[PDB]
Ligand binder design. Structure first.
Ligand SMILES: [Fe+3]
Ligand SMILES: [Fe+3]
Lengths: 240, 236
């Protein structure tokens, strides 16, 4: 199977694969590895995928369970990844954005690294979690920025400071050079590494009917560059 | 003779029981120097005898004789002044007060993430074509206190873009100039101020309309800053 790089920082297309439960572990590995490298990966023409068969496919990768965000970061062990398929699409608009939060850390100036490495944030939805702003990716070892719309404030700074620094970091993360905007066709499937991305839907299709189907994979508790784990202030962990 | 009286919990003190001038006791000079370094700006009242001559001579006893935006003096230069001695000559009928902020306390009260940031940030200062790259945290060469070096002569932070620079500059300045960290002085005739330019910012206030206001300043030579790693500011 084949992997086409869609831009220099994020995104790839994968060809030669019919997604579903029957996949050869060597293929499944190539996909996993493509996902970890490119952060978000696309398959086209998967018209045969239905609800049951998406789930089944998801199951080979891990364990099934508007504004820029990482999914369910108001919880401690937020998802590692999702598989999203187009079901019915609008006649125009409806594209989706992803940003690479590992590339975004790696390109911080040294002073902003020192800042983010030591910075922690309260995320909320009731769910309240203090997470580090820089996590060590458990599979890749890359440090990734952890922020997005669930953030309420930063631990130890005031309102005004929190909001300003939040915007500084979000502007780097969402800089067009670090993002991919996907135009959805029928039979499109997307898979993203939620431990190294943010995403955002675009509401540019007037009130048109749109329906996607998503399967989400269970993820772990972030740890910072010192090994300290996120802290539950409020709410339960996610469970299967 | 001399007493030093705290004027605010973070900055400022008045010193009485001292006629300023070239004639001062070395113990008296030292007790002033001490207060200046602890309190960042100090004030002497009723110094009606002082004149240009006696101020310069007094200034000479402290070190070596060389505005309504918040700034540290002459930071576009590498070896910017350590301190200044300033006397009211002619004050307006209203207005004319002056602000100082304590840039050592400002550093010290930074959340640690922000200390990390500032310990590693360098700023380009400019002004007739002066340009220096200063650390944002300098190590005070007499007290060893770490102090924020910023103010209006800053154009940008090194390795950061324009938007970022501005935004972080404003985050810093907001902490530095928080009213709890500042002193606003109402000048009376005979008043003299001395401030440590290595641990302050100051600001004049233009709330006296047209009027004439005249002060006399004697500035003292300071050395080049170094960061917390020993690195010197670099002339461009
Ligand atoms: Fe989402
Ligand atoms: Fe000045």
């Amino acid at each position: 199977i084949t992997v086409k790089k869609l831009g220099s920082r994020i995104g790839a297309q994968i060809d030669g694969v019919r997604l579903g439960g029957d996949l050869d572990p060597a293929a499944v590995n190539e996909i996993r590895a493509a996902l970890l490298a490119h952060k978000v990966v696309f398959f086209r023409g998967q018209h045969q995928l239905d609800d049951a068969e998406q789930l089944a496919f998801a199951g080979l990768l891990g364990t099934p369970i508007n504004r820029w965000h990482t999914d369910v970061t108001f919880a401690a062990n937020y998802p590692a990844a999702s598989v999203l398929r187009a079901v019915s699409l609008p006649s125009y608009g409806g594209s989706t954005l992803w940003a690479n939060t590992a590339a975004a850390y790696a390109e911080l100036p040294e002073p902003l690294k020192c800042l983010t490495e030591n910075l922690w944030a309260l995320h909320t939805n009731d769910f309240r979690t203090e997470h580090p702003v820089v996590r060590v990716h458990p599979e890749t070892g890359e440090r990734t920025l952890l922020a997005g719309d669930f953030v309420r404030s930063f631990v130890g700074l005031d309102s005004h400071e929190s909001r300003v620094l939040f915007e500084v970091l979000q502007r780097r993360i969402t800089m067009p050079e670090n993002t991919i905007r996907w135009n959805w066709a029928p039979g499109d499937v997307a898979i993203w590494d939620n431990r190294a991305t943010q995403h955002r839907a675009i509401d540019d299709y007037d009130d048109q009917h749109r329906l996607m189907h998503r399967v989400t994979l269970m993820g772990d508790v972030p740890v910072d560059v010192y090994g300290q784990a996120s802290r539950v202030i409020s709410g339960a962990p996610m469970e299967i």
